[PDB]
C-alpha cells in the first residue's frame, strides 16, 4: 500500500477569518490494493480523529484548526467516500490507484491565521 | 456617499530571486468597472521588475492576474531585497466634489535562494535597547522582520519593518513583545525579550 | 488483512490585502457675507476599511495634483483657480487628533496603530490664502496610498 499526496492551491482567509467550502485542499493519491477493494474497505486517520473528517493545524503553536472531508470520484463522476477516522457520512476503486480530494469545510472555531497547516494522516486498507 | 475597493490576492510577494516570474490576483471588489495600475517602487518608494499588465480594465466583482516578472538586474544573495508593489484601480454657494482612487501597495520581498529558512524560524532572534529616546530593534538575520505587532512596556508602538542584517529605531518599562507577520501573511507568535 | 501506509497533509493559507473606502459627503459649503468660506466645516467624512490590524497612520497617504504638504486642494471649475484648502485628520482610541499622511506628511498628532477594522477620517476645511472664493462647484482627484505591513 502506497500513500502520496499533493497540496492544491492556496486557500485565502476570508475577512471573518473563515474559509470556504468544498475547496480543494490537496489529493491524496492510495495505491496497491487488491482487485476488487472497496471504499468502505479504506479509512482515513489522523490525531484528532474527528469522525468523518481531516483535521488540519497551524503551525504557530496557536493551535488554529479547519477541518476537511475525503471525497473520490468513480468513472461518472459520481462521489467515493472512504471512511475517515471511522466514518462515512460503498464503491469500487479504480485498478491500481486511487485519488481522494480532501476537501474544505471551515475552520473549527476563532479566525484562521494564514501560514503553512499540516495533518499527519495514515490510511489502513482492510480485506487484503 | 461613494465606494472604493481593491484587494490584492496576497499581502506580500516573495519572489525567488531569478525566477522567471510569479502571479498574483487583483479583484476589483466595486460595482463599477475600473483601469487598474500597476507599478513596481524602491524600497524609498521612488521609480528591475516587469508588472503585465501595466494597465488593464478590470470589470465590477471581477478578478484578473498580474504576473511579476524579474528583468535582469542584480540583488544582494546574504540577504532579501524589498520593492513595493502598489496596484491602484481607477474609478471611470461652494458645491464641492471629490473623487478618490485606492491605490494599494504591498511587499515585493526578493530573496536569494541562498538564503536557508524563512521569517518565522528567526523571528525570535531580533534583540532590543534604548537609545536617543527610541526604541532599538536589532535584526541579525538576512530576512525582512516585518513586525506585525509590537508592545513596550505595555504600551502599543505601530509597526514598521526591520531590515536585514541592520536596525530600525521606534519613537517613544524593559519588556518587548513582538510578532513578525509571516510569508503568508499571517501573524506568527509571539516573542518577548527585556531591553539590553 | 489490513495494510497500512502514512503521508502528510499540507494546506497553505493566505491573508489577502484588502482595502476600502467609504465617503459620505458632509452639508454643502455656504459662502459667507464677507466672502469666506467657514474654516473646520466637515466637507466629508472618509472610512478607511479592509486592512489588518496593525495598519498605521504613517502608511496611509492621501495625495492630489497640488501636491500640498498636509493639504488636499479643491479648485473650481470656471477657470480661474479659484482654491482652498483642507486637512484629513481623526480620532484614535484615548479620543487624541491623529492623522494620516497628505501629501507625505501628517499635519497633527503622534503615530498610531488605526482602530481595528475600520478608520474613519474627516476632511476639514482650513480657508485659501487667496480669499474671495467665488461660488461655482470645486473638485479634488484624491489618491488614498495604503503600504501594508
Redesign the interface.
Given at each position: 500500500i502506497t500513500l502520496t499526496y499533493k497540496e492544491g492551491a492556496?486557500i485565502?482567509?476570508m475577512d471573518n477569518g473563515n474559509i470556504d467550502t468544498e475547496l480543494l485542499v490537496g489529493t491524496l493519491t492510495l495505491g496497491g490494493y487488491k482487485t476488487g477493494t472497496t471504499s468502505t474497505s479504506v479509512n482515513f486517520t489522523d490525531a484528532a480523529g474527528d469522525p468523518m473528517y481531516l483535521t488540519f493545524t497551524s503551525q504557530?503553536?496557536?493551535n488554529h484548526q479547519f477541518t476537511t472531508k475525503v471525497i473520490g470520484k468513480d468513472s461518472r463522476d459520481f462521489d467515493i467516500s472512504p471512511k475517515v477516522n471511522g466514518e462515512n457520512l460503498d464503491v469500487v476503486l479504480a485498478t491500481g490507484s486511487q485519488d481522494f480530494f480532501v476537501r474544505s469545510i471551515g475552520s473549527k472555531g476563532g479566525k484562521l491565521?494564514?501560514?503553512?497547516y499540516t495533518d499527519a494522516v495514515t490510511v489502513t486498507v482492510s480485506n487484503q | 456617499?461613494?465606494?472604493?475597493?481593491?484587494?490584492?490576492?496576497?499581502?506580500?510577494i516573495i519572489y525567488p530571486l531569478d525566477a522567471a516570474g510569479v502571479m498574483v490576483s487583483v479583484k476589483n471588489?466595486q460595482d463599477y468597472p475600473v483601469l487598474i495600475q500597476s507599478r513596481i517602487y524602491d524600497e524609498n518608494?521612488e521609480k528591475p521588475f516587469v508588472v503585465t499588465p501595466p494597465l488593464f480594465r478590470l470589470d465590477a466583482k471581477q478578478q484578473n492576474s498580474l504576473r511579476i516578472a524579474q528583468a535582469g538586474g542584480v540583488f544582494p544573495r546574504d540577504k532579501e531585497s524589498l520593492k513595493?508593489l502598489?496596484v491602484?484601480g481607477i474609478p471611470p454657494?461652494?458645491?464641492?466634489?471629490?473623487?478618490?482612487?485606492?491605490?494599494?501597495?504591498?511587499?515585493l520581498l526578493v530573496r536569494p535562494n541562498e538564503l536557508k529558512g524563512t521569517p518565522?524560524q528567526f523571528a525570535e532572534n531580533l534583540s532590543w535597547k534604548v537609545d536617543g529616546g527610541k526604541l532599538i530593534a536589532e535584526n541579525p538575520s538576512p530576512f525582512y522582520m516585518?513586525?506585525?505587532?509590537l508592545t513596550f512596556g505595555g504600551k502599543?508602538i505601530?509597526?514598521?519593518?526591520i531590515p536585514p542584517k541592520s536596525t530600525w529605531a521606534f519613537?517613544l518599562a524593559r519588556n518587548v513583545s513582538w510578532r513578525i507577520?509571516?510569508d503568508?501573511?499571517?501573524?506568527?507568535?509571539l516573542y518577548s525579550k527585556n531591553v539590553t
Open positions: 492556496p485565502t482567509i504557530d503553536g496557536n491565521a494564514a501560514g503553512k | 456617499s461613494k465606494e472604493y475597493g481593491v484587494t490584492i490576492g496576497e499581502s506580500r471588489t518608494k513595493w502598489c491602484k454657494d461652494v458645491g464641492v466634489f471629490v473623487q478618490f482612487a485606492i491605490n494599494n501597495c504591498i511587499k518565522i516585518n513586525i506585525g505587532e502599543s505601530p509597526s514598521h519593518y519613537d507577520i509571516n503568508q501573511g499571517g501573524l506568527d507568535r
